[PDB]
Design a protein around this ligand. Sequence first.
Ligand code: NI
Ligand code: NI
Ligand code: NI
Ligand code: NI
Ligand code: NI
Ligand code: NI
Ligand code: NI
Ligand code: NI
Lengths: 388, 388, 388, 388
Amino acid sequence: MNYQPTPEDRFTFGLWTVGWQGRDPFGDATRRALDPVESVRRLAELGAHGVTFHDDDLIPFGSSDSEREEHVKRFRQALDDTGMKVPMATTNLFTHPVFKDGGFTANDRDVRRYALRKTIRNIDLAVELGAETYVAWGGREGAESGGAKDVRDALDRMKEAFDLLGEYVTSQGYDIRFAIEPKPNEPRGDILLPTVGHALAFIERLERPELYGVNPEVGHEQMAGLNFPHGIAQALWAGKLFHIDLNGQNGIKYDQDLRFGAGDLRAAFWLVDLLESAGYSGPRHFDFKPPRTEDFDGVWASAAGCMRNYLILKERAAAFRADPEVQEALRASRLDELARPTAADGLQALLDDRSAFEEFDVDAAAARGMAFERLDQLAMDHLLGARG
Amino acid sequence: MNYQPTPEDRFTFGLWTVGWQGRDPFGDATRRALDPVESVRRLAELGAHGVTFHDDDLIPFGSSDSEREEHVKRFRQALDDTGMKVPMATTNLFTHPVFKDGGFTANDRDVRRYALRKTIRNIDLAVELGAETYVAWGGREGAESGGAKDVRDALDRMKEAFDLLGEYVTSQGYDIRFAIEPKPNEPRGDILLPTVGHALAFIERLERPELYGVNPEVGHEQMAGLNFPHGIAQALWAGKLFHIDLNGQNGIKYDQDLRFGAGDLRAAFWLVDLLESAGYSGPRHFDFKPPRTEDFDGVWASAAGCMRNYLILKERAAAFRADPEVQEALRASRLDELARPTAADGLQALLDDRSAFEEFDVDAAAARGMAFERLDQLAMDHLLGARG
Amino acid sequence: MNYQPTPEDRFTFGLWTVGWQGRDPFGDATRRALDPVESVRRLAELGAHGVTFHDDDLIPFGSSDSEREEHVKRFRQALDDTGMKVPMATTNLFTHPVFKDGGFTANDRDVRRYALRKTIRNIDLAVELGAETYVAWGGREGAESGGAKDVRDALDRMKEAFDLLGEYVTSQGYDIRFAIEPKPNEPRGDILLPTVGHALAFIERLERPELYGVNPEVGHEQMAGLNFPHGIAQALWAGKLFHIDLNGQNGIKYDQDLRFGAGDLRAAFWLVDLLESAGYSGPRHFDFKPPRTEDFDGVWASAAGCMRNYLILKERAAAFRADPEVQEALRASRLDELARPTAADGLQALLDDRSAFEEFDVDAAAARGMAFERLDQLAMDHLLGARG
Amino acid sequence: MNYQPTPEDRFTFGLWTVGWQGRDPFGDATRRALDPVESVRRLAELGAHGVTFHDDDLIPFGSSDSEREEHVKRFRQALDDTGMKVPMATTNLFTHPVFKDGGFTANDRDVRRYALRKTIRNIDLAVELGAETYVAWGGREGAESGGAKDVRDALDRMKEAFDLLGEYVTSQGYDIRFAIEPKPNEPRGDILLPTVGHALAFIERLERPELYGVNPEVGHEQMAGLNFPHGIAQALWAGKLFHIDLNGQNGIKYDQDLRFGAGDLRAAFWLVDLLESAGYSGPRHFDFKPPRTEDFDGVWASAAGCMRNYLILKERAAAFRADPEVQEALRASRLDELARPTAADGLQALLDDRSAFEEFDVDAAAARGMAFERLDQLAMDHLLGARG
Ligand code: NI
Ligand code: NI
Ligand code: NI
Ligand code: NI
Ligand code: NI
Ligand code: NI
Ligand code: NI
Ligand code: NI
């Protein structure tokens, strides 16, 4: 068993992840800044497929049009030198004090207009660099108090913003799709579109829903105590999993962004099983923060660990589904029956089917055990490589 | 200030609420069963508008077709005697052991067929009694372990079930709509459609989405640590708030179903403000459990408290919105600007607007305080009746 | 690698665990009751060391003094027939409606007196059967509302109860110790002594603290989002880990009592590592509920899984600590330095040590990485059996 | 009803609270720094009694011995000019990168020695300024991963540190006591001594326990989903409430530090009731952060709101306890009986009391309702000023 990643595994990382300097709400940075070129090179050596960026990670805020040009050219050369791709980009609408009440849903109308112009400028840059997905994380869209934000008006403003971005992309003929990244809270007390479900429901109200999907993050759904593989299954069912952010989280608390596989390990196993079996073909993107206890050697070790843990879990999930004892257990728990229509015979035949009600033996049905505990222990054995 | 409810306030209660005998997972019942007729009469005396029921609350499971007839006739006479209405009904698909792996998404296909027939039978009864809304709470739809439930297949089965019920209602020409009640967990480890957002997104995939809305419950969204007024605002924005369940919950733990106003009192204030200001016109339904510490006098006191606390909060929220100091504060925090379109001028004019980017003074914008803390203290003063 | 338990592994189970009939707050029992004799025999065949009981699990509430005698004799014969031991016993002070406001801290004084007499009667029975530890879980001690319970008076009543039980045991010359089992909530809204920490602090205020320790349960500390291995380390540090309850829990929600190893698997690994390395010598007791989806075959599979997962994790934790690469990593992260006194030289020498402050190079110290991410990935590799 | 604070209400604020510049983990500061002298003056005008500080709030880290002298003299003059007191001080052992793995429990021994010297230096300064309480918040004491911290060794190091500080204070003859401030997590993944209970238990293992108490913070116990008034009652029962930090928190999430009265309003009511009725005489200290949405006018409004909400709740709790209808309800719920000993007659008389068991009517006892819901609605009415 060797678990070395290759660019064909499509592992990607944000510039902001390995480049996080370790500033947290109670302390100063513990690491120096990383040159984006440096990160691209180090990640390529680790076996990564590509990188992602916020506008402000690549071009420092307030850069002159020409300093801009210069930063991009250096970056493009590093991409050329290494074979690294840029599959996704996003906008920083949360760090600058002007976004303290939000970007697209700020109460001040002039700030909402600025937020849109800042976004459109980076969409152009993303397309140039070849990105196929443009992510939006509305980190400042929300409130700490009840009267500060009329949420129906804010949702109108949010729809207005995304509809305009969709108009722009279509008018320019760009081949790029949008992905909304939910988070329930932090840094705002409550953030709008707090879960995968709220984001999926919102998308259905946009003018061109086909251009929008979700970019769920493992830790964010877990901050609401939700089951991440279930949420991803709903997103896949809807045809809306455009991208995904992988990391780890230990429960309901502040957003930890631990390396993937840390946090809830069994959820990571069921997630990998689902992604691989559904044939998800997008990037396996890591949105994580190497802990501020680490020096740069620790940063690269943490990034390598993300990829390693994905490949180990992939191997264990494949072994699980391939095991004939597990296929027998699946039939014993009637997963095969779950996949069959309830009533392909139609409503009238169901209504006339006396075996469905009048003469249904409910006591016999109730006595049938589901055998889920044996199945789950087979999954545990596979995960731990303890199959005897 | 007098806070007496009248049937015009549209307060409703489930039979199962005041009739809960106090059985919990660690203990026996502490109260005798209540005769549904008794409950209808006592609730009418308290000023309630009507009652709701599960099929099994009104007709004990396994009743003969004629015992059935008899239970309904007694109930109808109590409704006639008191003027009480029956605006909503629902199905019990969770108590009987045959539903231990779910009703609509049970792995066993014969159980899913039985679940549909049990539901259809009660829809007929609901229409007869005049209900306008039929609620579905999929309490057993979910799993304790990862391999027990393929969630895409389960969502296919769930869609299949709701599509069939919609076919039935339309074919019968019934004027009744469906409302899905989300809950994140309990009694299953994770329940499918765990929040208002997931339910709204699911509805958009049904064949006739116009027949389906949500029935959110205060405590259930709070079990995921979510902001209930925000979720209700999203549901109103979508035109899908068909019904609502009011109660109290203290945080992320087991489903407490405390009387309304208990639990998170400020959230109750912002909820009432939103409902009243959005002109929600459905029932104000209480889905609550009088604590098992109480005798029947305590049960009626708890039910009266539900209604009282709604009317006090209604008065305080109205006073808040009517106060000219608060209207000035709202303008100071630019709630008026939030309600104005960001770019009614259109995309091209936004792109050509140099005041939106090239010459936007971001530092000046960032320095503007939002004045949210003064506004929130005005709301606190109003809530506590301390306005000086 | 074979993972078969033997009675020498000291695995124990409560009668109430495999015997749980599957009644939950939303549904009826799905399994018939188990005869305690049946359970003892089945558990012995699985490799268990012994069983535990509540008074009411073994002798149905309200039994005549002679029916009592009969139930105990049958039980003792099953113990004799199988070699099974009874290391712990406890009292049911939560199921009967008379305990709806608590046992030791009920507001009614006559109920508190009854609670003490019911307890003392079972202590006598526990000693007869050879138990060394008597557990107290104050499941009903607490409140749903603020005014219902003066908590200082309730703590006085709680101390009074435990002091009296300690007087009784000493006066009778019994060799038995007490263990308090914390839980933060459920079935009460908030339960008194909600965590391992509150229980340890309370014990220090009893008249004979040496007779009392804690019986922490994995899932219960996790219901407060706490780190269970940390809490156990504090209990070991204090010399108060008298017993332990092993199971699994997925986060902050209702008390799931899943089989051990389910729920937070990495926490289970760090717990086993700590128990084995601290040389904890008491029973490895499982307080778990086989899910109500299961028939009796599923019940025994779930119980076997508890033991299996302990032995797999024991093997992986031992391999981790024995690996020379891990010992090197531990030194690299300065775990050796953590175990050395900070200032064995004493206060004055610390005050006079200029290398401790005046001439301490804080920048050099701050630049040293802790190398925790490499260490944690070594632990992950060991846990998953992926060491290359 | 007028709710103006005076210095006699003993309201205090940390320099770091109104002086928080609004830097959060996702964004830059939104406010300029405040001169400590400026804060003292503004707080005095608001009616505050005094201020508290971390060493680094008052003297910027790395200050020369003489720059030090200068900062203190300016501060002392502002205190003299306004009549403001300094009742508590504390050490910053969390911001500087050298504390990234902790201060007292850092794995590096030289960092632990530095942490102690930095603390001792500020204790001297605290005594000079008249502080009576010295707080310790071990924000960096903890871990993100299982192997990084042996918690028994860390607790040995923690005890060693506090024992040395107690030696120092006694040797110097200072009249100052220590208060440990628990927090469950953030900025570390898990923090040692995570709740009031763990801190109380730890204190009992110090060499001179009488010198140490707790400084609980409303939001911190709520981050573990615990009931703060209950925890404070346990701390009062133990004689260990040396100080308290007041603020608001909405549930289990990141540490919000909202103004007092925000967050869980009913918990704030029950807390004030308990503090006032137990005659707590220390400072009413606010550890809060004015939201980063605010300008300086908003900062002062938020600080004023802290004090206002305390005085409103004080008035409502006093009215509640003074109301004869409430005293009757308290007797009806048998709070009077809770305060009476269970068995002042002693163990033998309890054992011989047949009314306690043999002839106890359990059914009659069980039928008695506790009347807690009526009592809680009286408390609600009082809180909302709706008593009819
Ligand atoms: Ni995150
Ligand atoms: Ni992300
Ligand atoms: Ni509920
Ligand atoms: Ni409900
Ligand atoms: Ni439990
Ligand atoms: Ni237990
Ligand atoms: Ni805090
Ligand atoms: Ni604090």
